[PDB]
Every structure is written in C-alpha cells, then in structure tokens.
Amino acid sequence: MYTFVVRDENSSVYAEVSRLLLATGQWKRLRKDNPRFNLMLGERNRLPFGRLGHEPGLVQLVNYYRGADKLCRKASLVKLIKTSPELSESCTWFPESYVIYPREVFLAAYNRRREGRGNVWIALISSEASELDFIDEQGQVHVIQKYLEKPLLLEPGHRKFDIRSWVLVDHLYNIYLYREGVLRTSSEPYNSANFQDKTCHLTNHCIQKNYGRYEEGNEMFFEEFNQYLMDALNTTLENSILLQIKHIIRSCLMCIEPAISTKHLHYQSFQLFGFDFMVDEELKVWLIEVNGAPACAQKLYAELCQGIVDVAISSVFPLSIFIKLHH
Amino acid sequence: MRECISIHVGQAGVQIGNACWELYCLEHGIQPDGQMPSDKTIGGGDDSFNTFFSETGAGKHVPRAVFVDLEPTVIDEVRTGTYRQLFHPEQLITGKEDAANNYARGHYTIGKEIIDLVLDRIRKLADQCTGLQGFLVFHSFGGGTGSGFTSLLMERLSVDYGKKSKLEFSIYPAPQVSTAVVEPYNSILTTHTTLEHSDCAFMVDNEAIYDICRRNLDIERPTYTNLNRLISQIVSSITASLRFDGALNVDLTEFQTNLVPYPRIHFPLATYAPVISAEKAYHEQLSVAEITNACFEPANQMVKCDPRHGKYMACCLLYRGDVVPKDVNAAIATIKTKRSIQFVDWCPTGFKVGINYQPPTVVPGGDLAKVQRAVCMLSNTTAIAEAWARLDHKFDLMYAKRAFVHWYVGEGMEEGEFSEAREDMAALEKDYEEVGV
Amino acid sequence: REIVHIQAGQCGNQIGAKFWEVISDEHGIDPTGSYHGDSDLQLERINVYYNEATGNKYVPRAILVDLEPGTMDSVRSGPFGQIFRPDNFVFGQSGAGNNWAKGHYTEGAELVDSVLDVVRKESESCDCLQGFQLTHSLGGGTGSGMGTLLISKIREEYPDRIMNTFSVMPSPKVSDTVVEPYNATLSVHQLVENTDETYCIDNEALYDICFRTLKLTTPTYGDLNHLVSATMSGVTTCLRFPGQLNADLRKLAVNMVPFPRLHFFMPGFAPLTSRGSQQYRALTVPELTQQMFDSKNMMAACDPRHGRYLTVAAIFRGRMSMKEVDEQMLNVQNKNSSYFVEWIPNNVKTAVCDIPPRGLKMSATFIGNSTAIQELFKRISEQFTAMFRRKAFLHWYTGEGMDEMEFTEAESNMNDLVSEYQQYQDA
Amino acid sequence: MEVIELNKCTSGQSFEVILKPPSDPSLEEIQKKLEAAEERRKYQEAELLKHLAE
C-alpha cells in the first residue's frame, strides 16, 4: 500500500492524477510536508530534488525530471540545440534562432538576408531587424527566432495552427507519445501583410479568447485533421507530419538523457511534456517549444491522466494509448 | 618530512581511527607490537611513513595519534585490543560520563573539564615533531562528543597552532544507524562553530556506506565494523600521499591548494571503486576505464548526490595498483564525451592524478576482496550541498517547535546559538548555489 | 553507570520485588546472590542494577521503603527477599491509610531522612551514578505521598541525576478507596515537575488486558503485576544488556522528551501472556510489531489513535532478523502515517537484544510518548472534580494540615498538562 | 588533452591532465563563552534550589 503528496494544487493534470489514485483505494494522500511518501507531485519551481531518495525502506518517485528545464525554457532550448552535436547548428527542424541579451551580432544573418533580398522574425513580429529595440525595452533574456512566413493553412478559413503533442517519459526513460494530439487553431485568416495584430499570427488559446467558428474550442483533433489531409492533400497524418514529430521528440529527449536520467539514482523521475509544432507549406514540421508543465485538452484529460497512472506510477508501485518511440 | 597528528574524538572517531591505524600498519609492514623490520634506521628517521609514526630507541613505531572520548567504554577496547602495545597510555584519554548525544554537554558542560588535558597531551606529540604541518580530526556529526567537544578542540587548536592546517573526516548522520533523534541539531551546531577552523573536511554519509555495504558486499545488516573497514580504505587512499613517496598531495597545505579554491566550500566529495565482496567466488577484475567510470556513479560516492546538477571546482584521482597514465587519459577522454562534467568558469577542466603501484591492502578476514587496481576520486562539486539541504530541513522541522531545545539550554547554551548556527548554514547553501547554479 | 532502585508502599514493593525476581533470573542470579549463567552477556552490564559484594555475590542496588511494616516482611519472606541488603529496609509503624497528606507532610516526613541516608550510602559506592528508578502507586498514601516527597528531596541532593518512575495509576476497576483520584492528582503534580521520565502503568489497562484479552474473569494483583514485570523487564532491557545504542537513563530522556513536562510514557508489550500459560508457538516479526502497537497491548488505558506519537522506542528480544524487524517497523509507520508527528525526523527507534525473556523465544517492548496519554489524566481529572466540587472527603487531608488551595493548584497543573499534550496533537 | 608535470618514482607516478583552460577568536573570548554558559547553568540550578527551598 502506497502514499503520495501534492505540492502543485494549481496543476490541472495532476489534480486529476490525485483523484484517480485516491479512488484506487490503494493510495493514501498525506500532508504536503510529510517526507515519508512514495510519490511526490512536486511544485513547479525549486522542487527539492536533493531531499528525495533518502527515506529508508521507501521507494520514492517524482513527477519531474531534474534538469529538464534546459529543454523547456526558450533561451536554454536555443542554447541546447546549438551546443549539442546530436542536434547541432545545422539542425533542420528548429527555426534559426539567436539569444539576444538586454550573441546580438546575429544581424550578419539578418543583414545577409537583405543582401540576399524574406526576413521577418519573432521574439513581437517585425521585418526591419528591430523590434531588438523591444527586447532592450523589456529587460529579460529573450530569443529572436525566424518567423515561419509560409505556414500550412487550413481550408476553409485560410487559418494557421500549431500542433501540441503530449509525451510521457517514465523512470526507465521510455518515451511515450500520447496517440491523441490537438491542433490549436486560429480563427482569423492569415494576413501576410499586417503582422501588427497577432490574432491571425499567434495560435495561443488565450490570444483567441471570431473564436469558435470552424471547430469547438478552436481545437481540432487528429481524426478530423487526418481526414482533412486525405481529402485535401492526398496524404495521411502519420506520413506527412507524425513521422517528423516522433523524430523530433526522440532527438530532443535522447540528447538530454545522460544529463537527466535517473537510472542508477537513489530516487526516480518521470515527467509529462508538451511539444509544440508548426507545419509549413511543404508539410515540413518545425519544433516551436517544449512545455515542462503542460495542461491537457478538456476531452483528453480522462484518458491521458489515466495513462499517466498506468505507465508512470503503477509500473513502479504495482497495484495502450501511447506510442513508444524506440531507441 | 613534516609530521601529521591524528585526533580521534568520540565513539565514531575512535573506532574509525582503530580501523585506519590497523590498515596503516598492514600497509607499512608494522606489527601489532610496533616493530617494523623493513625500517633499517633504528630509533628515528625522516621517511615518508614517519609523518604518521614516530620511533622509539627500541625500534617501536608509535602512531602520532590522540584518542579522546568522554566515556571510557570505546577507548578501553583500544587499551585491551590487538594493537594495545601500539599506543602509549597517555595517547588514550577518557572521561567518566559521555555527552549523552548533546552538543551542549560535550562542548560546554563536560568538554570544559577535559579540554586543557587534551591540549597538553596533544602538545606532547607536537614536541616530538621537527616540522609539524597540522592535524587530522576524526569525529561524528551526531554524537554529543563528536560534535560538541570537536568544535571546542578545533577552536583551541586555531589558538595554539595558528599556522597549522586542520583536516576533518566527518561522519554525517543517517537514520539507518542513528543513535539520537537530535543528531541534526548537533550536526548544524558543530558545523557552524568548526567552519572557520577547518581547511578541508571529507564528509562520509553513513547512509552511503551502509548502502554500499548492502549492495556490493552483500551484507544484510552492516555493523560499525563493516562500515569502518570500508571507511578506512577511503581514508587510507586519501592520506597515502602523506605516507608514501609521491609528488601529488604531499602536505596538508596541498590538499587545500588542490581541492579548496574557496575557504567555506571546503567539503570535497569522495567516490571509491571497486568495492568487491571477499565471498564472491568468481570475479572479473575491473579495468582502469571501468573503475574510473565508476567514480561518476552516485552509488559509489561517500555522499548520495547528483554532480550532474552542480559544478566542479577541482578533481583529484587517487589510484592504487596496476595503473599507468596512458590508460587513465584514455579512460578520461571517453568518460568526458559521455558524462555531464561541468567546471566553474574560473577553474580549468582538469584532473590531478596520483598513482601508487601497490594495490589496496585488505585486512585478513575482512569483507573486501583483493583487487588489482582501485581509485578514490576527490572532487569539489557544489552537488554535495544537497547534504546540507537535507540536514538543514530536518533541523527546521524540529526547531520550528523548539523540540528538544530545552536539553541544550539546560547546559548553558542559548537559543540564539541555534538560529545563529542555522543562519550560517543558510549562508553556506547560498554560497553553493551561487557558485554552482 | 549505576542505577539506584527505590520501591515505596505496598504496590511499589510488590511490583518492585517482582521486577528483581524477573531480571535476576534473566541475569542468572539466584536468590542467594550467586551467579549461575551460561552467557556472559548476562554480566557485562550487571553493575547497572547490582552491587558486587566480596565473595562474587551480587546484591541489588535496591532500597525498600514503606510506612507499613507488613508488606516489607512479605518481601523478605518472598522467593528473592533474602537477596536484598538488610540495611536497605526502611520502614515505619504508622501506615499512611491511603492519605497523600500523611505520606507527604506528616507520617512520611518522619521517615524520609532515614531513606535518604540509605540512598546516600548507595550513591557513594557508585562509580558514576546514572540516577534513580522508583516504583510506587499513585492511589495510596505512602508510594504516592511519601514517594513524591522522596523524589523532591532526592532532586535537591542530586539535581544533575535522572529521576525515573514506574507509577501505577488508580482505576475504579481495581480501586482500593474513593480518595485515590485525590492522591493521584496530587502526585501527578509532583511528577510533572520532578521526574525526567515516568512510565504510566495504568491499573485500568492492566485489568482490561487480564479480563478481555487473557480471559481472566477475576484478575488478581498477581495477574496485573505479571504484566507489570514483563513491561519492566522490557523497558530496562537496553539498560541491562550491551547494545549498539549503549542506552542509559539520560539518553532515553534526551531522545524521548522533546518538551520537559511531556515525559509520561505509554508502555506496550507483545506477546501478552497470563502466568503459567503455554507459549508453544513463537510470534513472527509481523505479529510482534502489529500486536505491540495494538491498543489491546498498551499498559496505559489510552487509545493511540486518539493522539500522535511524539517519539517511540522499541526493543525486540530473541533470535530474529533485524532486517525484517526494520521492514515491519518502517511498515507500521507508513500504514499509520497520521499517528506519528511529521516534524520529528527518525522519531521511531528500534533496538534488538539476543536474549529473550523467560518463557518466550520472541518478545517486543514498546515505549511511546503519545499525546493520547492525555486521556489518562483527563479520566483522573474527571474523578477528582466529581468529589472536589463538593469538597467530599477533604477532611482526611485538611486534618493533616492541607489547604483546599493545594488541591486547586494540583488540579490546575494537571489540566495544564492535558492542554499541553493537546497542543502538539494538532501541530 | 594536455598532460603536464609528470613525476615518476619507484612507488608510482603523478601528473595533471587539462581538458580545457578556464573562461579567529582568542583564548580569552573562548574562556569568556565557556564561563558565560557555566554561569547560566549555575543560575538555573540556583533557581531550582530556591524553588525547592520554598
């Protein structure tokens, strides 16, 4: 019989993991500061990893990988990709990005584009190689990244979207891709001229509150998007997009495995990730960012949060919806 | 040659001292009666082993060591043990009643009754030295004597020996073999008072040694004797450069020069490999690459922590046995490509390597198998601060209720010393984060 | 590290004599003081409770006290009564008549100096005195009233020694007189201030164990004291035998008492046996740990699930796997998380002794500092107030010079003790 | 990797490998504190003995 502790009440995903484990009857919840737990659902910042794995007779597990922030922060991700030979500066699926501090001689690329005659970027979107001026005015480490000027636009609507994939990595560093993704749509037709208003340029659910016109909650699931690619483009989601998505996810997590793996550690880690992808006009997939504390989609909470219990928790403490990315 | 005086305080310090000096005698060919036939200069000498042993006219080689405990049970076993002839009776100092797991009792009430006597007996050994370089102090964090008296002694040694180096071998408390619920209190109190007086301290977490004995020596329930024989191998590996011919870590000052670039961050992490059971009937001798790679596995460390999430300030590799530099360098090259080894920006990324050709010595009838090559890594990494975080949190849990505090106030201590000690620990954790993050 | 043992009054001398009988057998000491033992673990720490007289004879460091000569004579006539030093018998002729005031203020003051002379004689032989262990009841007059007067005077002359008591709490299920809640409340007032550790031996729990668990319809004092002697052997095992902990009375107090006044322990024992009973099947380690923590095995009539453990010390006796003991001990903490305080790390300590007690191959003894002990003091406080609100039976005490204000203060202090235990139950 | 300061002897050898370059109180105050704590013990004991005398 096992026990756990909740230290991120604001977590939507692990609020459901709390209830699912309690409803099992074989899991008891303690006060958040009781250290004789089996599983910690830790806070988002300054999680005390150093205090884990020192309770005699207790196998301890935590829902976060110490060091995964190097992948889930905008500046460190650009660093991680350029410094790592497994990814490299020649990495073909990450947009050309530079870390500008309030390596700012990056203009040799921007000023080579004007010599080569498109050069709009993002931090936030403009073409005159200056916003820079908005990065200094904000006073925080920012990333300047090439804007994907020719995205894939859904019809009807000429709309832009991004793809969110949920990835679960267990204590054995098995990489599990949730079979259900989601497209976060834009409801505004893509305007290549006026980047000032960013509601046709930013697919964030919040930035869209025309919302809700084409599909519910501005969220299109994989079955419809697959049917669209078949009817409109004579291809499938697996071939045209998901093969690249699985390659990118595996490439990223394999790169940092030596730094974060808990294989021979006194405590064990798993973590749920949210990868954000963009698809250009050629059906080429680009990685936008990695989310370390991802929220799920309303319809998928029940299935994903269950699958977290089966593969990430009950596999350690004994009482598929995932694609295992083999390495 | 410059002499070093070893001081063993409290039960843990004494019993680990027994194991170390037993191992030293086997390593140098010194018999339990103090005779060393290989020593051809009778009655004196300036050889490397004379750093730890003086000589009588009768050819007896006597440890430059003082044993101190506030009760007599443990040191009496030294007085009647296998090496009873090794030590002069004035080197073994006992009181009548211990500190009862209470830092305040060991530091204030009882230690004040015996501190002058101990310093007098220490001064007797220092007078036998032609160039005393400093002291090696063995003690527990959790015991009332190991914590309270040690910190009192270290203060006085700074007064009497202002220019002498002081190194520590400190047993960090673990519940698996704990003796007191107030061990976090004693640990924080003694670390605060001793911090300015110690140049370098090698912490040994009993939890790490306990688990290594279980996993690698297949000992279901390790005893103090099991723990101390393993500890003494690591201590001997660390002090070998003072006792044998060599160019690396040849004096106490070099330990601080090589391992401690900043004074308060003077707690190097020790990692030792290989630990192999004597009972294991079939064993495949581990190569230089294998034992060197094992130095970066937390399971082989003296303190459980993750150096991948800290930064290095210095790294020392101490090999014993069949090891040549070419294989060390090849092993380091491979390991560097595959592991997370980050040095601070104001330190070069480099390893200082020492090799002694003698393989490790093992006590007959012990649990450690004979191996052809072994290594002890001394790295100064910020990751060891995880041990401070663990200790300070346990301190915080009890002190928020002032649980057990009355036992310390009753001995003349003030509540202000708890929070003053805790603020110093808070500053120490901050120092480690600034350097390491 | 010698301990000086004192037994006062009828109950104190009765359980005291049984204690010396039990541990003399465990250490291989016969009624004449001669050692006849196989193992030398029997003699390594024999000096803790025994003086070695010339001739290789061991004499208990025990002082036997009563205002009544009769129970003293019954001890001398007992199986081991001849082993005690004759100079250590200190008795009066009056008898306290279940009157705390007589034991504490009048009849007892006449005799207390003679006891202190014997205590002083024993202390001056001690290489290094640990402190004192007293056995007595709280419901009578001598063990309660004179016992606590003795404790106060011993603290005056030995302020830096440990004072440990085995204090038998009164219960109407065994009751000898109506005034016992008075005597107990006045005594607890003394114990809170002047002892470092008190084992609460509750006659209510002893009766309930004999009746409900051991199927004894008519439990006698011999039945109750059988549980007491098993308990006293267990909680002194780590003082009498060599262990990795090297326990003594001071280390026990330092580790069990986080706050000076909260020093009243709940003992527990497993397996529970009646006298002469058959124990053919040895308990397994899972059974020992489960039974020892069961409310049915507590020697204080308190529900452990009505409070939280501040600290716990447990000693397992016999040949068994220390690894398995640790697993079971760590297991019972995990399954009963809510009944141990979270803010004292490593507050449950386990020790092992190879030598089992007589008649068993495996036993387990439990020392708990639980906030549920407030139920015991509440029960006595309620019985006290039922009489005191009408000043009933007070004339027995005012006749000896006591004022009602003294009763009010003792009641108020015990109610404060209850509130203090309650504070850490919610923490 | 640069191997420097190789020193050899019969007992072994030592060297340094570089993978990449960089980028107290007096005796009197001790007795002060040992005695101030002792007086706090004597005061607390004297208060107990005064309480026992009442």
Ligand SMILES: Nc1nc2c(ncn2[C@@H]2O[C@H](COP(=O)(O)OP(=O)(O)OP(=O)(O)O)[C@@H](O)[C@H]2O)c(=O)[nH]1
């Ligand atoms: N590794 C190891 N640890 C020990 C040994 N002896 C005691 N300890 C540890 O030290 C702590 C207790 O301190 P001790 O050294 O035994 O106490 P002390 O220094 O004699 O001080 P007092 O007995 O309180 O007067 C506990 O955490 C023990 O686990 C030993 O021989 N080897």
Ligand SMILES: Nc1ncnc2c1ncn2[C@@H]1O[C@H](COP(=O)(O)OP(=O)(O)CP(=O)(O)O)[C@@H](O)[C@H]1O
């Ligand atoms: N190089 C780029 N090119 C084109 N569009 C980009 C882009 N980078 C970001 N975007 C767009 O901006 C929107 C928000 O980008 P970003 O991922 O940085 O914000 P965010 O952190 O809020 C995502 P989440 O809410 O999942 O954490 C994306 O939906 C995308 O449409």
Ligand SMILES: COc1cc(C(=O)c2c[nH]c(-c3cccc4[nH]ccc34)n2)cc(OC)c1OC
């Ligand atoms: C374990 O059992 C016993 C111990 C002791 C004792 O002196 C001691 C020392 N430390 C402790 C101790 C207590 C509680 C939590 C703890 N966390 C670390 C140590 C510790 N308790 C005495 C006993 O009987 C007289 C006895 O038997 C029952």
Ligand SMILES: Nc1nc2c(ncn2[C@@H]2O[C@H](COP(=O)(O)OP(=O)(O)O)[C@@H](O)[C@H]2O)c(=O)[nH]1
């Ligand atoms: N457990 C136990 N309790 C006793 C024994 N004798 C007396 N008592 C209890 O002690 C109280 C009476 O005190 P007692 O010791 O007889 O009077 P005293 O001689 O003046 O101390 C009552 O609550 C009795 O139940 C005994 O042998 N065993």
Ligand SMILES: [Ca+2]
């Ligand atoms: Ca010589």
Ligand SMILES: [Mg+2]
């Ligand atoms: Mg984001």
Ligand SMILES: [Mg+2]
């Ligand atoms: Mg000791």
Ligand SMILES: [Mg+2]
């Ligand atoms: Mg009676």
